[PDB]
Structures are given as structure tokens and as C-alpha cells.
Design a protein around this nucleic acid. Sequence first.
RNA 1: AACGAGACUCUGGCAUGCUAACUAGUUACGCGACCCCCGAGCGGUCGGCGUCCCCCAACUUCUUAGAGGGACAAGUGGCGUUCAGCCACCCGAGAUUGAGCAAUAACAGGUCUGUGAUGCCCUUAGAUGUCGGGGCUGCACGCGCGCUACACUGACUGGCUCAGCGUGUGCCUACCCUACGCCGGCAGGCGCGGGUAACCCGUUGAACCCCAUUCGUGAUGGGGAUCGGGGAUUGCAAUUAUU
Lengths: 68, 141, 227, 141, 191, 104
Amino acid sequence: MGRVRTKTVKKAARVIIEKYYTRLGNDFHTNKRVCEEIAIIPSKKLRNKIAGYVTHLMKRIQRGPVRG
Amino acid sequence: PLQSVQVFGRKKTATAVAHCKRGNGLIKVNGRPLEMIEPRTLQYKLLEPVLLLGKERFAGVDIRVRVKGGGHVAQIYAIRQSISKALVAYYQKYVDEASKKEIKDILIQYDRTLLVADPRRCESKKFGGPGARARYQKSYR
Amino acid sequence: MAVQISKKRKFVADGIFKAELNEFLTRELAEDGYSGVEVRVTPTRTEIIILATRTQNVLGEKGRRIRELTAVVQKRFGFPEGSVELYAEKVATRGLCAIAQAESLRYKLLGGLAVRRACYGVLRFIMESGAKGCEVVVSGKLRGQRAKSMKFVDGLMIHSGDPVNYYVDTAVRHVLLRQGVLGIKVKIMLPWDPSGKIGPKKPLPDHVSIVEPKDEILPTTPISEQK
Amino acid sequence: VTVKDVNQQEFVRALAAFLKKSGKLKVPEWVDTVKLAKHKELAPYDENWFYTRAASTARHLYLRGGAGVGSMTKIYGGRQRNGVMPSHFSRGSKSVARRVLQALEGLKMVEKDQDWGRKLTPQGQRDLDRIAGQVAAAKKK
Amino acid sequence: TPDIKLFGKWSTDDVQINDISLQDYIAVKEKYAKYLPHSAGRYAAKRFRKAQCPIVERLTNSMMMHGRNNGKKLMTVRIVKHAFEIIHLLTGENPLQVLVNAIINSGPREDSTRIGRAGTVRRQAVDVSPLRRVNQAIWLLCTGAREAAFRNIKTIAECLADELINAAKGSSNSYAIKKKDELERVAKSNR
Amino acid sequence: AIHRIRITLTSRNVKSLEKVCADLIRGAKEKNLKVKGPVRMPTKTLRITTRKTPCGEGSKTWDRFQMRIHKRLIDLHSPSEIVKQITSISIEPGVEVEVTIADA
RNA sequence: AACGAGACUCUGGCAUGCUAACUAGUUACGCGACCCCCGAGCGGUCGGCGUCCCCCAACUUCUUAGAGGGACAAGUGGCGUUCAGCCACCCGAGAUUGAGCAAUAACAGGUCUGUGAUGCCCUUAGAUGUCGGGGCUGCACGCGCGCUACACUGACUGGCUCAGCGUGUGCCUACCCUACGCCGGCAGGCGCGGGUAACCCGUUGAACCCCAUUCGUGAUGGGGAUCGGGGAUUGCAAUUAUU
């Protein structure tokens, strides 16, 4: 188990949601392909992570305001 | 018109390519009867799908299988895994969904790697042991 | 003139020629600011591109030295006569050339000069020339007959993972004195990430960054515009 | 029938008896002093071992592409217990197999064909499949 | 029968578990009856995963022990086919009901353990899981047949079928029902 | 005449290999020489398993090194002139080529 | 803010998707040849068994190796400040298949017998630099790493039947891997041929295992230490026994 997300993910995840808020869905696959086009993530496994956290944030942003 | 669909199964690098070609009965392996494949104590095992599903599913095909790889044991699981999937593929292609969906429920009930495959193969040894985990004895005096 | 050796053995013998030469040259061109080679066999001809910073001292007056070097190789490895052809090359940007930077520090030291001020002088050059960071070590004796170590470091460095093969170069050179031996080591970090040569790859090494462009505008209102 | 269909433990035990009736096989004198392989520690119990081994010789030639005196030995070789030293594989005798194959060739059930190996004569192939059905006639396959 | 495998000849119907405690870790017939005891090699990667696989297979696994017999699971199945055969001729039953009694009669009811006080041995009585009982009972009786055939003219098959009789009907001529009662006799004392 | 001429490539770098193969398959198919594709052969392992410690002392350690060679070959059948003309040129990296008169 | 952790590299696990193959296969016939009626029939044909024949056949599932995709705690139910996360389940390859790389500072750790790396000291013609012979194997004893065993879940003798990582002469200076034929109980000898190697050895026709005899609880036929005699191979030479 383990697999607690690092800061490199959480730093860019916030940034990518702020400046491309409109492009986001709430599906994994759509939010992946957007991150692939609006930026380059130099790995493939890293890309699959940053999408999933961008998805997980976008769930909460449709409720009350996030403090990050 | 000629009908022929092929499948394979694997377990621990033992491939068994079992083609289902139109015909009637007479399943073989290597041009020999399945009745005499040689440990002949596991004879009930490779027979298991044919016996359990009935022999009236095996009345529109001639199946022959070629094998290679593995030991005496792992080959038996390979030929079983292929013939199970071979039968399915014949129905998937020339007959409707509800025929083979039924057959899928039966096999996967007593799943034993008939329609799936183990991902387990040997791990690579590292120094300081005769095995991958086991180590040489350590002495302090 | 045949036959020819196994394909497995073909690469080993090439490696032996690539390596032997690279230590042959380093014992003659040390003072001329040696920095490596790059061999190339070409149709019915050998090219040996003898990279050094100052081609002046390599050439000599009337090309004497280059003529000595070609005649050596023509006898030593038993090359067919007249096939060998040397060429020289000057490198631009000399502070990313760790091998030459280390061997220059050597002659500065062996010339008779203090260690601290010498280490600082080489440091700011390799930093100025471009580099994320850089490092120097001097391990051996000084101020008595027990050894010590002296690290001089500035900027960024990496030590782990596969980026070590790309984004740093490292050199080792022994220098003698009247009391024992002193070890020099120089480790320098390559800076390119935007583009070009392309030499080292574009992603960042240790923390692999997300390269992020930005655009964001709308002024849209409904209208029909015929074309 | 083809020889594939039947059991092979049964095959040899009727084929060995067949030959000895018909006056076939001129045997070597040495047959009662012969260890039979380098990795054995004893002579065979059997007193008609020559007849038994010629059966197994002719069968393998039916299956595979045929090969010489070297290959027959490699098929028969087994494990060698070297005592206190760890066991290893080794090959058995040669000069026995060299008498076997030449004795068969005297009857023209084999013959030196092209591509580096003896191959079994059509007369030989006739006689195998002839007694192959005799096995099924006997017990009941 | 045409929709549920026997054992190659032995019914898994008319087989009961006669405790309410030890069922759901003894099962053999819900759909878990198969022609042979073997697996693809999934048996454990979770704690609950151990339970599911048959009792007859578990018996075959714990039969091959002590160096020279490890990795010879096919040789092991030879001994089990003779066992049921000998049990059926010898007494005349559904020979699985023999085995189920033999397992249930050999599992302990209370057990002891260690506890550290004053740097000296003290013991404490504690209870035991149903899963523990099954694991223990399979261990104990297999040790009997292994022990007996270590210098006897009798084969291990003969020894093992004898050991399931004396367990299935308690009589204290088995290695199991002896060793069961030893533990409980301790558990009474220190409690 | 038109002879089955085989252009064998051999390398240790998968980028350097493959793009130089592509160049020769374009330039061939461009001129309709009826070129036959790459036949990628099994990549072979040179292994060297030796001590990591000179003058053995301390915990016993080793080091696996490996070199991976690569072979692949494109079969052409066309006049030997235009092949030997175009082949030897347009190669940037250190990658070997061996031309054969006939094989089939 | 930086180094280490992670990220990274390699490897395993998922492709009837993509790319393409007589130094890789399969299928399909064309087949003609062999074989047995073995099954319907008659032996032909239809079906079955492999091999030769295979192509200007068809294909790339199997084999090979390249480009790509796929797994993210993604979805659901619990739990947590409802944050960071944790537990169960669906799909399925579950968020851990195994390795490589690895910080600061330190050790009077090992290595002058790897180094034409190196300080100082010593020795240098009656040499610490070359040939011949002997020794590092010498045993009343102590310890460590292992190998083979104490049997019937076995040994013995026949019979059946399955694999993978590699490696190989043309190199160092004289040397490789072996098929096939012949001779010998065996070790081995001898005559020919192939292999720069997905091409020849090798469709690596391996062991445990599997099937049938024999032995019978006996330091036994379990165990194979010790030891006598004889035959071969390597080498310039085999004694303190090379194998």
C-alpha cells in the first residue's frame, strides 16, 4: 500500500486547475488528455497520477471553497 | 465455406494452440488421443470441461492442439485452458451471444485458470543465496 | 584479407581501440587542453577527431605534431597504409568540459600555487560558462603528513537515479608532488533544458517539472459572421 | 491404426515377443556380461533385454526423422550416481546400439537413408501399424 | 452428479458437518467438490483465502513433509486414492464421513500458551479458533502415518487409513487423540 | 542484373539503428525497388558477472554489466549499382552496414 | 530553497489492436508418394497418422522486436477534521513482481602482492632482477563453509515422457562445439561433414516425476568410506596415486 502523493503532484495540480478550470470534466480519461495538451508531463506514469488528483480536487471544488 | 478460429492458453511458459475447425467430435493433442496423455492420474482434469459441459457441445468441431514448453504438469493446465477457450470462440463467431454467455457462467464458476492465466513466473536470483530469498549461513565464530 | 571475426567480438575490439587511444592521447596532450576524441570509420578511410581546446599547440609549426601522431597509429595497430586520416576540432564552451577543467587545475597546482584560491578560480569559470552547479574535491596531504579533504561546492548537484548518466560529467586526475600524491576530482552539471544542442534531454533531472504554457481569454457574444 | 492411438507400455511388450518368434534379430555374443550403460551399477534382470530394446528403437524412428547411433544413446541415457559426489547425467553404451540398428537393417526394417540417419523401411512401417491394431484386438481400446 | 463432480468415484453428497461451530471452515460439497484435489497455485494471499480450498486437498498438502518428499505432490495423491479405498473395504461407509469425524475428534477445545513473569516460565490457558482446530487436526494425524511407516513393513497408505479409523472412533491408539488430550490435560492445570 | 541484395544493419542503439533503416526503406520504396521489410533478429545479451571489490574483503558483492547488440536486415532485389551507390551515403551515426551479393 | 526519499532506468505481468518476416511459423490447398482399414465405404474417396512435396498461395494467432495503448486510489460502500488518508468490493493485471541508481559526516576498516598510481627507506653483481629440483597437500589435535547418508514416501532393473538462461574453431601464439559412418564392455580410437551462428551442434529427444518387475525391516541388495590389481585420455613431465 502506501502511495501518498508527493508535493510535485500537489503543486502542479492546483496550478493546472486554476488556469484551465473550464477544460475539466470529472472523468479520469478526459482530464488526462487535457493535461497532456495544456502542458507536457515528461513521464507517462506521472501523467496518470496528476490527472487523478486533478479529478479528485474537482469533486470538492463543486462544493464549498477550497483553501489551497 | 471453411470455418476456423484459433486460441491459445499459457501457464508458466507452456503454450498450447488449440484450433477449432468445423467437423464432428474427435479431440486430439499432438495427433494422439487425450485419453492417453501421460501422467494418466490427472486424466480427469483435461477431460473436466468436456465431461461437465457434455459431449454435445463437441459435435460441430474437430479440435487438434499443438504444444511446447513447460514440464509434464504445466502442459496439462495449458491444454485444458486452450480447449475451454477454443469451444467458446467457435460460439462467439458463428452462433449468438446467449449460447456462449451460458457456457461462460459454467466454466468461470469452478475457475481454476480455464479462462484466465496466472501472471506468476520465476523471480531472478541475486547473490549471497542459492535461492532468490534463501541465504547462506552466517557465522560469528 | 579475410575472413572476419564474430559479431560479438567485433564490438569488443572496437571498444579496445576506442579506449586505448583515449589514454594514449591524455599522456601527451595534457598541457594542450585535451578534452576527448570521437572516432569515425568512413568509406575507405579512418577519421580520428582529436578534440582539444587549443588547436594551436596541437598543430605545431608546419604540422609536425599531427604528422607524428598519424605515423604512430599507422604502425601501432597495423593499419593499412594511408587509410588513417587525422582531424582536429576546437570545442566552444569550455566550462562544461570537466575533463579539461580538471586537467587544467592540475597544471595550475603543479605549477606551484595555493589550493584554496586555485579551486575558487576554476569554480567561477565553470559556473560562469553555464552550469547549474559544480563541485571540486582535493583529497591528500597538506600542512603535515596526515591527509584531509577539501570540498568546494556551488549550485545544484544530483547523485541518484538515471539522470546521473546524462546531466553530469565527472573526471579524475592524479597529480604528484615531492610528498605523495594528491587526488583531484571535478564534477559539473549540464544546464540545457529549453533546447539544443539537443545534447542532454529536455526534462529536468531530479525534480521532473511540468512545463506549463498559459493562454486564457474569452470575449464571446452571439453573432453570425458570414465568410 | 496409427501407433499414436494405443498405449506404448503395451506396444513394446507385444512387439518384443513378435520378433523372437519369427527367428528375427541376430544377437551379439555379449549379452550376459553387459552392464548396458555407464551410469548403471548392475546388469539387467531381463534375459531377453535385446529383444525389448529393438522394439523401442523401431518405434522412435516412426515418430522422429531418424538419427544415428549417437542419438539413440542420448534418448536412453539417465542419471549417474557418483556416490559422495553429486549426481549428473551421462550417456550409456554405444556398441550395443550399433549392433541393434545393424541387426534391424539385416531384416530390412530400417535402412540408411539420406540426411544423416537411418530411417524405417515401408515394409517396417507396414509391420508396426499391423500389430498396432492387434493391441486393440487383444484387450479392447 | 452431472452438474457436480464426485471425486472420481466418491459422493460428496450424504456428507455432513455435525458441528455448527466448525462448519464454514470445513466445506467439501457446496460447489467445492472436484474430480481431483489440485489448484492452479492460488491458496493464500489473504488470511481468509486459506479457508476456501477443500479439506481433501489440505490433507494432501500436509502429507508431504521432511525433506525428501517436498515437491512431489503427484506421488502424494497416490497415497490418498488408496486411503479412501482401504477405508471403504475395511469398515464400509462413505469414506469422507470417516475423515470429517477424524478431523473434528482431533481438534483441541482449549490450549495453553506462554506468558512472561519474573523471568520464569508461567503458562496461561486460552481458547482456540475453529480455523486453528482444523489446521492442528490435519497436522496431527498426518504425523502418525509418517511415524509408523518409518521402519514398518506396512506402507503409509495402510498406516494412514488405520489412523483415521482410530481418530473417527476415539480409542487412543492414534497419535492424534493421545496428543489432543495431553494439551487439554495441561490446560486444566494452569488456567 | 537484378540480384537479391541484402542490406544488413547492426548497432547497439535502438534510435540510431531504426531511423537509418527507415531512410533506406523510404528511398527504396520511392524508386519502387520492391523492397522487403526489416527482419528483426533476437537481441543478444553479453553478460559479465564479476567482483565489485578488488582484493576481496568485506561483504561479498558482485556487479552485473550487460551489452545489448541489435541486428536487423532489409532484403532488396534490384541492380547492385544503385544500391551500393545510395547505401553508403546518408548515415549520420556510428552504425555498421554490410552489403551481401546474394543470399536467395 | 537545496541534497537523500520519491520521480528515474531495467525487468515481469495485459494486446486475435498497429508495424513485418523462406536466418521465424501457421493455415490452406495443389499435391503426388508412404502407411493401416483403422472408421462410413472396398483398398478409391471422405476421415485419421507424420514426412518428403510445397508455391509465382494465403496469413502473422503461435515465435521474433519495434512503435503505441492500459492502472490513476479510477468507480462504489464504510471510516477519517470529512482534510491528508485508511479498510472492503466491482471491473480487472489492484493501488507492494524483482533488481539497478542512492545524502551529510565518519573509520587510523581492507588493499604498496591490480596499477609504468605514488612518498620515504632498503637492496642492487657473491643481486630481492633467470634455468633445474623441492614446498604451499607435510599431522597426537581445535574451529568454520559445504557435500553425501542413515532406507519401503526407498533402492534396483526395464519401459514412457516434458524445458530454459547460454555457449561454440577462424581468438594468445595454436587452440572450438559436434552430427553422421566404422571399431571397442567401457573409458576411448578412427574416417568424413557442418557451423562467423533464429542458418550447424539442437524441433537442445535433461533430471526429479510417471508406468511395470525384483528386494523385505535385516548395519540388509540401505551407506560407499578405506584399499588391491588392471585399462584409457591430457601434457615436455602425472611419483606424495592430474583426470
